[PDB]
Amino acid sequence: AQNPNCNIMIFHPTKEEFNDFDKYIAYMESQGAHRAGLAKIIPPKEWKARETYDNISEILIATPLQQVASGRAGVFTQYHKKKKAMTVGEYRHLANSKKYQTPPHQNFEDLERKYWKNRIYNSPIYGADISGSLFDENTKQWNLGHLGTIQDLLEKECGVVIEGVNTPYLYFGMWKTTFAWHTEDMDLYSINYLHLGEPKTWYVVPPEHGQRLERLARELFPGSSRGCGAFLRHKVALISPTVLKENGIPFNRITQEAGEFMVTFPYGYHAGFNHGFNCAEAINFATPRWIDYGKMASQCSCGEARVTFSMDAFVRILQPERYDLWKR
Ligand SMILES: O=[N+]([O-])c1ccc(O)c(O)c1
Ligand SMILES: O=[N+]([O-])c1ccc(O)c(O)c1
Ligand SMILES: O=[N+]([O-])c1ccc(O)c(O)c1
Numbered sequence: 362a363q364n365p366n367c368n369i370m371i372f373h374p375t376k377e378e379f380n381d382f383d384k385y386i387a388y389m390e391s392q393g394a395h396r397a398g399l400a401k402i403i404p405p406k407e408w409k410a411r412e413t414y415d416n417i418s419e420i421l422i423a424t425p426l427q428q429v430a431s432g433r434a435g436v437f438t439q440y441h442k443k444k445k446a447m448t449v450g451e452y453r454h455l456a457n458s459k460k461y462q463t464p465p466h467q468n469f470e471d472l473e474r475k476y477w478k479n480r481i482y483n484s485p486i487y488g489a490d491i492s493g494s495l496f497d498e499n500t501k502q503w504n505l506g507h508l509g510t511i512q513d514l515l516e517k518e519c520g521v522v523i524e525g526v527n528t529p530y531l532y533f534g535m536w537k538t539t540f541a542w543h544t545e546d547m548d549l550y551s552i553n554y555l556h557l558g559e560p561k562t563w564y565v566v567p568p569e570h571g572q573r574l575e576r577l578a579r580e581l582f583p584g585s586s587r588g589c590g591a592f593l594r595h596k597v598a599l600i601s602p603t604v605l606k607e608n609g610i611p612f613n614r615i616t617q618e619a620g621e622f623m624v625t626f627p628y629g630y631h632a633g634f635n636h637g638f639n640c641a642e643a644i645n646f647a648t649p650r651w652i653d654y655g656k657m658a659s660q661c662s663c664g665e666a667r668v669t670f671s672m673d674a675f676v677r678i679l680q681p682e683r684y685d686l687w688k689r
């Protein structure tokens with residue numbers, strides 16, 4: 362078996378290998394990449410997402426989110442307080458202000474230490490889930506707005522045509538902005554391109570050990586667990602690498618830099634934080650191997666977890682019992 366220790370693998374496709382997206386994902390999996398739950402892909406040197414990032418300041422962040430923490434330094438929840446709209450130019454200026462800017466630090470490790478020590482004492486503002494794309498329309502390779510759709514994948518594999526669309530989302534981050542422990546909707550893949558700015562650190566649990574993380578989460582967030590059988594779908598729970606280690610949860614970490622892609626694999630729990638002002642673009646996608654994960658994906662129906670219009674059809678076709686119950 363390839364990659365039995367479930368290490369995060371890093372790939373350097375040639376420009377020829379970068380043409381066929383589906384084929385390269387399949388290649389990565391043939392090398393065991395999916396066992397980690399996360400892979401890094403460094404594009405060939407000949408490739409670029411767009412010419413420049415010079416004219417992005419007038420993009421609007423309609424609903425910036427202030428991420429307010431509760432709990433302990435290594436075990437906390439965050440809730441998102443809505444703030445007034447601001448442009449990306451205004452957001453960048455805010456990110457670089459004394460209140461919000463990245464502190465002096467020696468290296469990524471020092472910054473990671475500072476993050477877990479001090480995150481709960483601040484409330485950074487995140488511009489998340491902004492529908493849009495920063496890929497040039499002429500970028501033909503790994504353009505996250507030109508991928509085959511999940512709806513077409515389902516149709517190709519299962520022969521059923523369904524409604525729905527899926528399009529990319531932009532994320533504008535600043536120091537300490539945080540993404541909570543989660544898998545994707547319907548345990549889909551995701552792909553994430555860091556367009557510009559400071560790095561993003563990722564933590565990931567191998568899919569074969571995802572239930573170990575769930576069990577720990579139930580212990581660490583007992584009220585949340587009682588409220589919903591799939592409360593990690595709420596995207597509110599953070600657990601530090603120190604606490605994971607103390608509880609013997611298998612995981613890995615890696616830092617993504619500007620110009621790099623990350624792929625998360627079905628049922629790969631992940632969490633992380635931004636180092637400073639940056640912009641990422643991400644989208645969910647599927648492969649034939651995803652279908653069985655989609656069938657088995659847990660669902661939130663306590664009401665908390667927000668779900669796209671397109672996720673309806675996935676549940677309807679792949680989990681008809683759960684769909685029928687959700688109706689009545
Ligand atoms: O940027 N890419 O991905 C490229 C650039 C040139 C090529 O000839 C190619 O096959 C891929
Ligand atoms: O703020 N809360 O609700 C919290 C904070 C930490 C926890 O471990 C928790 O179960 C709930
Ligand atoms: O709050 N902490 O630091 C904690 C809480 C629970 C744990 O099991 C742990 O190893 C650390």
Ligand SMILES: O=[N+]([O-])c1ccc(O)c(O)c1
Pocket residue numbers: 656657658659679680681682683
């Ligand atoms: O455990 N699962 O994954 C299940 C259990 C029942 C279902 O009806 C389902 O669609 C998935």
Ligand SMILES: O=C(O)CNC(=O)C(=O)O
Pocket residue numbers: 532539540551552553625641643644
């Ligand atoms: O970048 C973020 O804030 C969160 N991204 C993801 O969870 C992802 O790409 O799957």
Ligand code: NI
Pocket residue numbers: 543544545551625631
């Ligand atoms: Ni994700």
Ligand SMILES: [Zn+2]
Pocket residue numbers: 588589590591592594595661662663664665666
């Ligand atoms: Zn719920």
